[PDB]
Design brief:
This is part of a larger assembly, with two copies of chain A.
Chain A: H1 46-53
Protein name (chain B): Spike protein S2'
PDB class: viral protein/immune system
Keywords: Spike, VIRAL PROTEIN-PROTEIN BINDING complex
Chain lengths: ~55, ~50
């Protein structure tokens, strides 16, 4: 994070990215991980469908 | 705790193992490293070379 917007980036070169659903994998709930924070992800498969269908 | 997640990634174990077992893994490291001091004291033939 840079203070306001969270980003995911590679390890040896700064290149921030928007955290979509394909940039991460899910394992379990969020009450056991120490230091987990709250945020939301912007998936690219829902509003692509919402733009055409609605 | 972020470093050990990067080191399970080398041996083909995903990051979800460490954070789901952070307390238990730390106890294993704590107890094993305490045995080393007792191991050298008990056996004097370790420092042979």
């Amino acid at each position: 994070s840079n203070g306001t917007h969270w980003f995911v980036t590679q390890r040896n070169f700064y290149e921030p990215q928007i955290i979509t659903t394909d940039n991460t994998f899910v394992s379990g709930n969020c009450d056991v991980v120490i230091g987990i924070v709250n945020n939301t992800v912007y998936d690219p498969l829902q509003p692509e469908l919402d733009s055409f269908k609605e | 705790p972020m470093q050990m997640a990067y080191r399970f990634n080398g041996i083909g174990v995903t990051q979800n193992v460490l954070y789901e077992n952070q307390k238990l893994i730390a106890n294993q490291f704590n107890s094993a490293i305490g045995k080393i001091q007792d191991s050298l004291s008990s056996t004097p033939s370790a420092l042979g070379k």
